[PDB]
Amino acid sequence: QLIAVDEKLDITTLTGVPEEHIKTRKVRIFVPARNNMQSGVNNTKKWKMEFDTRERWENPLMGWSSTADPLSNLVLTFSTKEDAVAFAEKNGWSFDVEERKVPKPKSKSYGANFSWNKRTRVSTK
Amino acid sequence: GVRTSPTGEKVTHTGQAYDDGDYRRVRFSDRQKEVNENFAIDLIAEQPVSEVGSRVISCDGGGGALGHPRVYINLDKETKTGTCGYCGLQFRQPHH
Amino acid sequence: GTSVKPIFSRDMNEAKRRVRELYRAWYREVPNTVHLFQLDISVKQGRDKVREMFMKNAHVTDPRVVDLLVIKGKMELEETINVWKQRTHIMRFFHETEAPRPTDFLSKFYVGHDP
Amino acid sequence: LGLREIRIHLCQRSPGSQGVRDFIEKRYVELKKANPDLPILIRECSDVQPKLWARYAFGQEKNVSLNNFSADQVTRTLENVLSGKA
Amino acid sequence: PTTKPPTARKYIWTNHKFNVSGTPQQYVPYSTTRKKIQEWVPPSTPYK
Amino acid sequence: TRPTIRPRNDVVHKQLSAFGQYVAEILPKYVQQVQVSCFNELEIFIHPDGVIPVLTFLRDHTNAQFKSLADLTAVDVPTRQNRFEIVYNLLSLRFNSRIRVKTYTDELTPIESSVTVYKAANWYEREIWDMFGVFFANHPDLRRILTDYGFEGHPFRKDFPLSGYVELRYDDEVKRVVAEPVELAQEFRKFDLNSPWEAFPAYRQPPE
Amino acid sequence: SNLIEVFVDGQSVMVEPGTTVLQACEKVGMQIPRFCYHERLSVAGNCRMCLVEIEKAPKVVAACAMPVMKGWNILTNSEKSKKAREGVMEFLLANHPLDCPICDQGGECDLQDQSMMFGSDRSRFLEGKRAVEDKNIGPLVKTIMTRCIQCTRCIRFASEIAGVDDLGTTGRGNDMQVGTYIEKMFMSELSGNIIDICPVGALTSKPYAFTARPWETRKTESIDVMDAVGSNIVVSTRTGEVMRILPRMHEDINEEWISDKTRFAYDGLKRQRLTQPMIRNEKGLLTYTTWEDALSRVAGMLQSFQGNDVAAIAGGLVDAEALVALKDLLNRVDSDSLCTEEVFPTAGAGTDLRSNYLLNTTIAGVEEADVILLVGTNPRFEAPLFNARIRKSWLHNDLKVALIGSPVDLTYRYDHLGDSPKILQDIASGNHPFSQILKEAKKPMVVLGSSALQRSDGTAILAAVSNIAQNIRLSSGVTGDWKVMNILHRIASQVAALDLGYKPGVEAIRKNPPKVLFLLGADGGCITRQDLPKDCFIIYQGHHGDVGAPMADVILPGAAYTEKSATYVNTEGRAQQTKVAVTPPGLAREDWKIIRALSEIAGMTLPYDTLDQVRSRLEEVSPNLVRYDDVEGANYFQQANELSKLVNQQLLADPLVPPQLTIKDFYMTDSISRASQTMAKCVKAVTEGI
Ligand code: SF4
Ligand code: SF4
Ligand code: FES
Ligand SMILES: [Mg+2]
Ligand SMILES: [Zn+2]
C-alpha cells in the first residue's frame, strides 16, 4: 500500500509557473526587522519569504508605476525557518536564509540614575 | 494664478509643464490641456489675518461639523502668525 | 522509510507505460485536431509540439508526479477532442505573437536589467 | 611563465589545516623576507579543504589542495611553485 | 433655485459647460508631477 | 455583558460537546480531535483514511443523520507539511444542527472522492481540483470547472500571484485572441497594514 | 544559581536579580505598553503606561522601573491593570491635538496603536486643549510640540547617546515644555535618531515631510555605504522611488541608530545621476551614445594596450563583485596595477595578513575594553556609530579614553596626550606614563585611523603603533584572544579591495603612468590628467557626475548601492550584502555586468555569467567574502609585527590633523553626499545659524 520511494520532493512541473520565474528568481527567507518608528514587536514573530525586486518604470500616460514581473507582491508566512526552507526547495526556488535577530537582554537599574561616583548619574530627568 | 511656459503651455498649480523636447506634448494637439485656473495658494494668501486678543485660538474651518477637525493654535511667537494646519487661515495677537 | 500512498502507479515502469499510452493517444489525435480546428500548422509540426511538451517533463523521477502529469495531459486531450477548446487555445502552444527572447549575455545586458 | 601572486586558504580550527597553520606560525615571515614583492594572501576557509592558489601571467591560475599536509609538505609545495619546477 | 439660490462662491464656475467628449475641448489625461531623477549635465568646455 | 456584546448559549455548547464526544467514541479509528468554538460550532478533525466512513456515519446514523452537504472546500496553509486542509460542512434537518469535518492532504496524496456519500460533492471536489490541485480518487469525471481551458496552475494556492502569469488580448496579425505574459500599466499597490502591539492576549503563542 | 522564580499570569519563569517586571513579562512573550521606556535609554518612569497589578498587592507598579521580587505573580491582563491603562491613555489624549490626517506619524504612531489596543474608544473631555509654540532645531528635525507627550526620550538620548546636553524641560505642571529655551540647532551626527525614538509626530523628518504613508512603503533590508561601519538599514521605497532610510537593528554593529549622513544623504541619489553611456565627439565634448558603441570603443583600447600600460582605480563606494570583475579583466591583460584611492602601507606584511588592516577588537569588543588609545583619528565623524559605542562604554563601563592628535570634541571627556607623532615612540619606549597605564590594563585597545595613514608617515606611524601593541603583549602577557591592535577604516570599499588583493594607494600609477585608466567610481581626485601622459584614455564607471566624470573619454553609467545586490566589508572584516530597492535609472547597469560585457566584447570573456557565479569567484579569491555575518578570524599580529621592523622610515614633525575637524566637514564626503541638498542645507546651517 506504500511505495517507499527515496527522492527529494519536486513539484515544479505541476505548479504551472513559467520557466524563467523558477530558475532566475532568488527568494529571501527572513524574520522582518522591527519598524524603528514604533516599539511594538508583534510584527517580528513569523518568518517571511519574498522574491527579488525587479524593474519598475513609469507609465507614459498618467506617470503610474508599471511592472512586468508577476511575483512582485508575493510574500509568504511561515512558522519556522525549516518550513520556509522546505517550501522553497520543493518549489525549486533558490533561496537566501537570514538568521533571526533577537534583541539581547539588558541590565536596567533605575537607581543607577542617581549614582554616587559612576558616570551613569543623569543631569536631568 | 496660471502662468505660461516658454513653449506655450499653461503651467498648472503643481508647476508641471512638458519640456521643449518632450514628445508627450503630442497628446495635446487638436485638443486642450486641462488646467485649473483657481490656484489655492494665491487664494488663501488673500485672506486677511484675524486679530484675536487670546493666547490660544481654536479653528475648525467654519461651518461647524462641515469643516475640518478642531485644532488649537498658539500665538506666543510675535515674529510670525499662527496658521491652521488644515485650512490655512492666519491668526495674530494685537501687537502694540 | 519515506513511504507514501500511490496515485496510480507503484513504480516508474507503470508510470512510463501510462506515459506511452497518453503519447499514443495524442499522436493519433493530432491530424484530426489539425483538420477540425482549421489550423494553418502542419501535422508534422503539431506532433513536434506534442513531442516537445512531453520532453519538457523528461527529468521527473517521481512516479506520483509522473501520473499527475499524465492525468493533466489526459484532461488536456479530453478538452481538445471534445472541441471544448477553441482555435486560440490550441494555438497558445506556439506563442506566435511573442517576439523571441535572446539568451546570450550581451543581448540581455543591452535590453535591460532582467537576467 | 612569471608568477604573479599566491593565495593560501586555510581553516582556523579544522585539523586538516593544522599543519598549514604551523607553517605560517613558523616560517611565513621568512618566506616574506625572501619575496618582499610577491603577494601571499592568507585567507580563511570554513568546512572546506585547505588550498593554495598560484596566479601566473595573463590570469592563469592553478590550485593545489593542502589537506592534512604537514608544515614540511606545504613548504615543499610552496618552494616548487616559487622555483617554477613542477 | 429661484426661491432659494445656491451659495455664491468666487471659485464656482460662472458659465456651466456640457459634456465635451468628442470635441477639441475634451479632457486629455497627463501626469501632474515633476521629474524625479535629474541627469548630470556634462561640461561644455573641452578637457584638453 | 452589555448590549454591544454577542450573547452566549451554554445549552447548545453542552449539546455540541456531548455529541462530539459521542462521535469520537464511536469512531476512534479516524477521529484525531474534537473542538467546539465559543460561538457554538462543532468541528471534528479526522485522518484522511476516514473520509468515506465518517461522512457515511454522519449521514446514516439514526442519532446523527446529517443528510445535507452545505459546502466542501479547501484551505491552503504553506507552512504545514500537509499543505491543504479539506473542510466538509454538513447539516442535519432532523436535529436542526450543523457539523464540520476537517482532514488534510499534500500536493501528491489523493483524497477519496465522496460522491457516493453526497452527490453534491461532485462539483465541489472539481472546484477544489481546479483551485488547489488536490486530486480526488474515483471521481466520476474530474476536470477544471472554473478556469479557462488550458489554464496552467491553481490560482487559490497562496504562492500563486494575484494577477497570474498570462493575460489575453486580440491580435490582428493572427486575427485571434492571444495570451502573453502579464504587464500592468499600474502595479497593484501592496499595503502593509498589520500593526505591532498585538490585539488579542487570549491567542498569544508561547515564545519557544 | 542566582536565578529567582517569578510568575507571569501564573506561569513560572526564572529571572536574574535586578530584572524588572517589564523584562519578566518580555521573557514570556507579553509586551507591556510603554511610552517613556526605551531599552537603550535610562529608566524614566513618567508616562505611567506600564502600570500593572501584582497579585495580593493593592497598588499597581510601574513595570519599566520596578525590580521583580521572588514569588510575585504579575497579572498583565487583570481588570486593575486594564483600567490603569485606560486612565493613562485618557490623560495622554486629553490635550493631544486632532492632527492625525496632517501628522506624518499617522500609520506609524505608538500613541494611535496603543490607544486602539489598550485605551478607550471615546472621549469625555469637554474642555479646551493647550497649544505650545514650535521650536527650531535645524533643517533635519521638524518640530511640532503640541503633539509632544513629554516622555523625555529625546532628552535622554541627547544626553546619554549623543553626548549633547542642549535639550531639556522648562516650566512646571501642564505648561512644562520640551526644548532648548534659546534659539539653537541640535546639530550632531546622531541628531536624526530622535525622530525614531519620539513615539509621536512631535519630532519628524523634515525632508521626508508629507511625502508618504507607512502602509504604502516597501521595505528593503540593506546596508549603508556612507562609511565603513556597515550599519544595517531599511530602505523604504514606493512606486519605484526611494522614499526614506531607517535604521535596522543589529546589536554588534550599529545597535539601533544610524548617522545623520546615512539617514539623510539619499536625497543625492536623485541628482547628478549618470543615466546613459557617453563618448567624446569631434569637438571634445561628451555626447550620449549606445552601450555597444562605448563598450567597443573601450575594448579597442583594451586590446591595443596591455600589461603596465593598463591601470584601474577604485572609489569608496565599490562593491566586491565589481572589484573582482575588474581585477580579473585587468589580469587577462597582464595588468597588476589595480589600486584604491585610500592609502595603506604596503611594507612588511601589508595586505598579506588580514588582521594587519582590520578592527580586530570588533565594534562589540569595545564594550569589553578598559583602556582605549586613539591615534590620529576623529571617530565622531569618520565612524559615528563606533564613536557612539565608545561613548556607551565610557558611560557604562568607566572606559578610559586617550587621544593623540588635535583635541577634537568627542562627546565625552578624554586624556589629550598631545599632537606630535613622536609621543607614540615615547609611549613605545616606556618613558610616557601612559605606557604604565596600558601595562596595568587587562583589556587594552589601540585604534589607529586610516586618515592618519593617508600621510607620508603612514608606514612609520603603523610601525610605532605596532611597537606599542607589541610592548603591551610582551609585558602584560597573553590574556587570551583579545587582539589589542586595531585599525579604523572610513570608506566602505577599502576592506573588500584589500581582501581581493588590490594595491592600497595610487603610488603604483604615479610610478608607472598608464595609457588607459579605469576609474571605477574614483571621485577622490587623486589622479588627474596632469599626472598622466598626453592622450591618456580614461574610462569612468559610476553612478554620479562628479570630479571623475568630466575628465573621462568614455562614461559607463553604473548602479548605486540602493540599486544592486552587492557585497561590502566593514572595518571589522564582516561581509554583508545589500538588496535591490529600485533598479538603476535610464540605461545604467550593474557594475560587474558592465565589466563582464566589456570582457566579452574585448574577447577576454570572464567565466562568470550570474551573480552566484561572481560570488563563487569571490570565494575562490577570498573565501571570507561569502560568509555574510561572520566577524571571527585568525590573529597574525606577531608575524606582521616582526615584518614591520624591516624598514625604518622616520616620522615628520607634522601634528596629526584629521580631515574632519568640525561638524561642517562631516556632511560632504562622497559623491552621493555632495549631490544632496539636505547635506548642503546642513552645511549652511552649521556654518551660519539662525
Ligand atoms: S502623533 Fe499620533 S495621535 Fe498624535 S496626531 Fe500624529 S498620528 Fe495622531
Ligand atoms: S518631543 Fe517626542 S521624544 Fe521628546 S519628550 Fe516630546 S514626545 Fe518625548
Ligand atoms: S513605560 Fe514605565 S512609566 Fe513609562
Ligand atoms: Mg516621531
Ligand atoms: Zn482652519
mmCIF file of N, CA and C and ligand atoms in Angstrom, chain G residues 93 96-101 103-107 109-112 147 199-202, ligand 1:
data_model
loop_
_atom_site.group_PDB
_atom_site.id
_atom_site.type_symbol
_atom_site.label_atom_id
_atom_site.label_comp_id
_atom_site.label_asym_id
_atom_site.label_seq_id
_atom_site.Cartn_x
_atom_site.Cartn_y
_atom_site.Cartn_z
ATOM 1 N N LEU G 93 -4.451 61.564 25.999
ATOM 2 C CA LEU G 93 -5.204 62.059 24.856
ATOM 3 C C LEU G 93 -6.023 63.306 25.156
ATOM 4 N N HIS G 96 -4.074 66.173 23.567
ATOM 5 C CA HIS G 96 -3.439 65.883 22.291
ATOM 6 C C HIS G 96 -4.224 66.525 21.147
ATOM 7 N N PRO G 97 -3.544 67.104 20.161
ATOM 8 C CA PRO G 97 -4.244 67.745 19.044
ATOM 9 C C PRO G 97 -4.762 66.751 18.017
ATOM 10 N N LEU G 98 -5.883 67.123 17.398
ATOM 11 C CA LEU G 98 -6.538 66.297 16.384
ATOM 12 C C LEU G 98 -5.840 66.498 15.038
ATOM 13 N N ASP G 99 -4.595 66.027 14.976
ATOM 14 C CA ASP G 99 -3.723 66.269 13.836
ATOM 15 C C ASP G 99 -3.436 65.018 13.016
ATOM 16 N N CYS G 100 -4.105 63.901 13.299
ATOM 17 C CA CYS G 100 -3.773 62.632 12.648
ATOM 18 C C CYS G 100 -3.763 62.703 11.124
ATOM 19 N N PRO G 101 -4.751 63.304 10.447
ATOM 20 C CA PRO G 101 -4.657 63.407 8.981
ATOM 21 C C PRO G 101 -3.459 64.203 8.483
ATOM 22 N N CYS G 103 -0.619 64.774 10.429
ATOM 23 C CA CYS G 103 0.578 64.328 11.128
ATOM 24 C C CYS G 103 1.275 63.238 10.324
ATOM 25 N N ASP G 104 2.593 63.377 10.172
ATOM 26 C CA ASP G 104 3.370 62.411 9.404
ATOM 27 C C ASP G 104 3.429 61.035 10.055
ATOM 28 N N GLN G 105 3.146 60.931 11.349
ATOM 29 C CA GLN G 105 3.224 59.671 12.078
ATOM 30 C C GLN G 105 1.870 58.966 12.124
ATOM 31 N N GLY G 106 1.046 59.169 11.102
ATOM 32 C CA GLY G 106 -0.290 58.604 11.083
ATOM 33 C C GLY G 106 -0.357 57.104 11.282
ATOM 34 N N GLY G 107 0.104 56.332 10.309
ATOM 35 C CA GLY G 107 0.040 54.891 10.444
ATOM 36 C C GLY G 107 1.183 54.255 11.197
ATOM 37 N N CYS G 109 2.158 55.379 14.502
ATOM 38 C CA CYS G 109 2.101 56.053 15.792
ATOM 39 C C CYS G 109 1.894 55.030 16.899
ATOM 40 N N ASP G 110 2.799 55.028 17.877
ATOM 41 C CA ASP G 110 2.586 54.202 19.058
ATOM 42 C C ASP G 110 1.431 54.726 19.896
ATOM 43 N N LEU G 111 1.200 56.040 19.877
ATOM 44 C CA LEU G 111 0.041 56.598 20.565
ATOM 45 C C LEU G 111 -1.256 56.084 19.953
ATOM 46 N N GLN G 112 -1.362 56.139 18.623
ATOM 47 C CA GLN G 112 -2.552 55.643 17.940
ATOM 48 C C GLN G 112 -2.777 54.162 18.225
ATOM 49 N N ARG G 147 2.104 68.215 19.773
ATOM 50 C CA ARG G 147 1.910 66.769 19.766
ATOM 51 C C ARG G 147 2.756 66.074 20.827
ATOM 52 N N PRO G 199 7.830 58.835 20.126
ATOM 53 C CA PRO G 199 6.678 57.985 19.789
ATOM 54 C C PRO G 199 5.593 58.706 19.011
ATOM 55 N N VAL G 200 5.616 60.035 18.969
ATOM 56 C CA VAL G 200 4.548 60.805 18.346
ATOM 57 C C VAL G 200 5.122 61.680 17.241
ATOM 58 N N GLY G 201 4.260 62.464 16.600
ATOM 59 C CA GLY G 201 4.667 63.311 15.499
ATOM 60 C C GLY G 201 5.242 64.642 15.936
ATOM 61 N N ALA G 202 5.592 64.753 17.220
ATOM 62 C CA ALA G 202 6.241 65.963 17.708
ATOM 63 C C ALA G 202 7.569 66.201 16.999
HETATM 64 S S1 SF4 H 1 1.213 61.868 16.964
HETATM 65 FE FE1 SF4 H 1 -0.102 60.059 16.532
HETATM 66 S S2 SF4 H 1 -2.047 60.504 17.634
HETATM 67 FE FE2 SF4 H 1 -0.911 62.478 17.513
HETATM 68 S S3 SF4 H 1 -1.708 63.466 15.619
HETATM 69 FE FE3 SF4 H 1 0.156 62.306 14.996
HETATM 70 S S4 SF4 H 1 -0.649 60.279 14.330
HETATM 71 FE FE4 SF4 H 1 -2.328 61.275 15.508
#
